[PDB]
């Protein structure tokens, strides 16, 4: 029900390390990576370009394990 996920706040280009300006928290379905994990994600790289408005999913961040 009101579980928040990381949603792309701007285009995140392929193989660019994530900065906190790139990530917002939002309740959406399907559930993706929990909002709580935004601190962890900083400096990790995404494996594909993530468009504005897209929920970050585990399989899009290289090196992610929850």
JSON list of C-alpha atoms in Angstrom, two decimals:
[
{"chain": "A", "resi": 1, "resn": "UNK", "atom": "CA", "xyz": [0.00, 0.00, 0.00]},
{"chain": "A", "resi": 2, "resn": "UNK", "atom": "CA", "xyz": [2.01, 3.26, 0.80]},
{"chain": "A", "resi": 3, "resn": "UNK", "atom": "CA", "xyz": [5.49, 2.02, 0.17]},
{"chain": "A", "resi": 4, "resn": "UNK", "atom": "CA", "xyz": [7.67, 4.63, -1.59]},
{"chain": "A", "resi": 5, "resn": "UNK", "atom": "CA", "xyz": [10.15, 3.86, -4.37]},
{"chain": "A", "resi": 6, "resn": "UNK", "atom": "CA", "xyz": [13.07, 5.71, -5.99]},
{"chain": "A", "resi": 7, "resn": "UNK", "atom": "CA", "xyz": [11.84, 7.45, -9.15]},
{"chain": "A", "resi": 8, "resn": "UNK", "atom": "CA", "xyz": [14.15, 9.10, -11.70]},
{"chain": "A", "resi": 9, "resn": "UNK", "atom": "CA", "xyz": [14.01, 12.85, -11.11]},
{"chain": "A", "resi": 10, "resn": "UNK", "atom": "CA", "xyz": [15.89, 13.61, -14.33]},
{"chain": "A", "resi": 11, "resn": "UNK", "atom": "CA", "xyz": [17.25, 11.53, -17.23]},
{"chain": "A", "resi": 12, "resn": "UNK", "atom": "CA", "xyz": [20.05, 9.41, -15.74]},
{"chain": "A", "resi": 13, "resn": "UNK", "atom": "CA", "xyz": [22.38, 8.57, -18.63]},
{"chain": "A", "resi": 14, "resn": "UNK", "atom": "CA", "xyz": [23.79, 5.07, -19.05]},
{"chain": "A", "resi": 15, "resn": "UNK", "atom": "CA", "xyz": [26.96, 4.41, -16.93]},
{"chain": "A", "resi": 16, "resn": "UNK", "atom": "CA", "xyz": [26.80, 7.63, -14.95]},
{"chain": "A", "resi": 17, "resn": "UNK", "atom": "CA", "xyz": [27.03, 7.45, -11.17]},
{"chain": "A", "resi": 18, "resn": "UNK", "atom": "CA", "xyz": [23.86, 8.47, -9.37]},
{"chain": "A", "resi": 19, "resn": "UNK", "atom": "CA", "xyz": [23.70, 11.77, -7.49]},
{"chain": "A", "resi": 20, "resn": "UNK", "atom": "CA", "xyz": [21.06, 12.71, -5.01]},
{"chain": "A", "resi": 21, "resn": "UNK", "atom": "CA", "xyz": [19.58, 15.31, -7.47]},
{"chain": "A", "resi": 22, "resn": "UNK", "atom": "CA", "xyz": [18.69, 12.36, -9.71]},
{"chain": "A", "resi": 23, "resn": "UNK", "atom": "CA", "xyz": [16.52, 10.57, -7.18]},
{"chain": "A", "resi": 24, "resn": "UNK", "atom": "CA", "xyz": [13.12, 11.36, -5.62]},
{"chain": "A", "resi": 25, "resn": "UNK", "atom": "CA", "xyz": [10.76, 9.13, -3.57]},
{"chain": "A", "resi": 26, "resn": "UNK", "atom": "CA", "xyz": [7.23, 8.37, -4.70]},
{"chain": "A", "resi": 27, "resn": "UNK", "atom": "CA", "xyz": [4.50, 5.75, -4.02]},
{"chain": "A", "resi": 28, "resn": "UNK", "atom": "CA", "xyz": [4.03, 3.88, -7.39]},
{"chain": "A", "resi": 29, "resn": "UNK", "atom": "CA", "xyz": [3.17, 0.34, -8.59]},
{"chain": "A", "resi": 30, "resn": "UNK", "atom": "CA", "xyz": [4.92, -2.01, -9.28]},
{"chain": "A", "resi": 31, "resn": "UNK", "atom": "CA", "xyz": [7.12, -1.30, -6.16]},
{"chain": "A", "resi": 32, "resn": "UNK", "atom": "CA", "xyz": [10.79, -0.80, -7.11]},
{"chain": "A", "resi": 33, "resn": "UNK", "atom": "CA", "xyz": [13.88, -0.04, -5.06]},
{"chain": "A", "resi": 34, "resn": "UNK", "atom": "CA", "xyz": [12.76, 1.39, -1.63]},
{"chain": "A", "resi": 35, "resn": "UNK", "atom": "CA", "xyz": [13.06, 5.04, -1.03]},
{"chain": "A", "resi": 36, "resn": "UNK", "atom": "CA", "xyz": [15.12, 4.36, 2.10]},
{"chain": "A", "resi": 37, "resn": "UNK", "atom": "CA", "xyz": [17.92, 3.10, -0.08]},
{"chain": "A", "resi": 38, "resn": "UNK", "atom": "CA", "xyz": [18.60, 6.47, -1.85]},
{"chain": "A", "resi": 39, "resn": "UNK", "atom": "CA", "xyz": [21.74, 7.05, 0.49]},
{"chain": "A", "resi": 40, "resn": "UNK", "atom": "CA", "xyz": [23.14, 3.74, -0.68]},
{"chain": "A", "resi": 41, "resn": "UNK", "atom": "CA", "xyz": [22.63, 4.37, -4.35]},
{"chain": "A", "resi": 42, "resn": "UNK", "atom": "CA", "xyz": [24.68, 7.57, -4.56]},
{"chain": "A", "resi": 43, "resn": "UNK", "atom": "CA", "xyz": [27.85, 6.89, -6.72]},
{"chain": "A", "resi": 44, "resn": "UNK", "atom": "CA", "xyz": [26.44, 3.56, -8.04]},
{"chain": "A", "resi": 45, "resn": "UNK", "atom": "CA", "xyz": [25.93, 3.38, -11.81]},
{"chain": "A", "resi": 46, "resn": "UNK", "atom": "CA", "xyz": [22.98, 2.54, -13.78]},
{"chain": "A", "resi": 47, "resn": "UNK", "atom": "CA", "xyz": [23.27, -0.11, -16.49]},
{"chain": "A", "resi": 48, "resn": "UNK", "atom": "CA", "xyz": [20.86, 1.60, -18.85]},
{"chain": "A", "resi": 49, "resn": "UNK", "atom": "CA", "xyz": [19.55, 5.15, -19.43]},
{"chain": "A", "resi": 50, "resn": "UNK", "atom": "CA", "xyz": [16.76, 5.86, -16.98]},
{"chain": "A", "resi": 51, "resn": "UNK", "atom": "CA", "xyz": [14.06, 8.27, -18.32]},
{"chain": "A", "resi": 52, "resn": "UNK", "atom": "CA", "xyz": [12.31, 10.94, -16.16]},
{"chain": "A", "resi": 53, "resn": "UNK", "atom": "CA", "xyz": [9.46, 9.43, -14.14]},
{"chain": "A", "resi": 54, "resn": "UNK", "atom": "CA", "xyz": [10.73, 5.84, -14.20]},
{"chain": "A", "resi": 55, "resn": "UNK", "atom": "CA", "xyz": [10.84, 3.77, -10.95]},
{"chain": "A", "resi": 56, "resn": "UNK", "atom": "CA", "xyz": [14.39, 2.49, -10.38]},
{"chain": "A", "resi": 57, "resn": "UNK", "atom": "CA", "xyz": [14.38, -1.27, -10.31]},
{"chain": "A", "resi": 58, "resn": "UNK", "atom": "CA", "xyz": [17.11, -3.42, -8.70]},
{"chain": "A", "resi": 59, "resn": "UNK", "atom": "CA", "xyz": [18.30, -4.74, -12.03]},
{"chain": "A", "resi": 60, "resn": "UNK", "atom": "CA", "xyz": [19.02, -1.31, -13.41]},
{"chain": "A", "resi": 61, "resn": "UNK", "atom": "CA", "xyz": [21.77, -0.37, -10.86]},
{"chain": "A", "resi": 62, "resn": "UNK", "atom": "CA", "xyz": [25.09, -2.14, -11.24]},
{"chain": "A", "resi": 63, "resn": "UNK", "atom": "CA", "xyz": [26.27, -3.55, -7.92]},
{"chain": "A", "resi": 64, "resn": "UNK", "atom": "CA", "xyz": [22.84, -3.42, -6.19]},
{"chain": "A", "resi": 65, "resn": "UNK", "atom": "CA", "xyz": [21.80, -6.08, -3.78]},
{"chain": "A", "resi": 66, "resn": "UNK", "atom": "CA", "xyz": [19.16, -5.23, -1.17]}
]
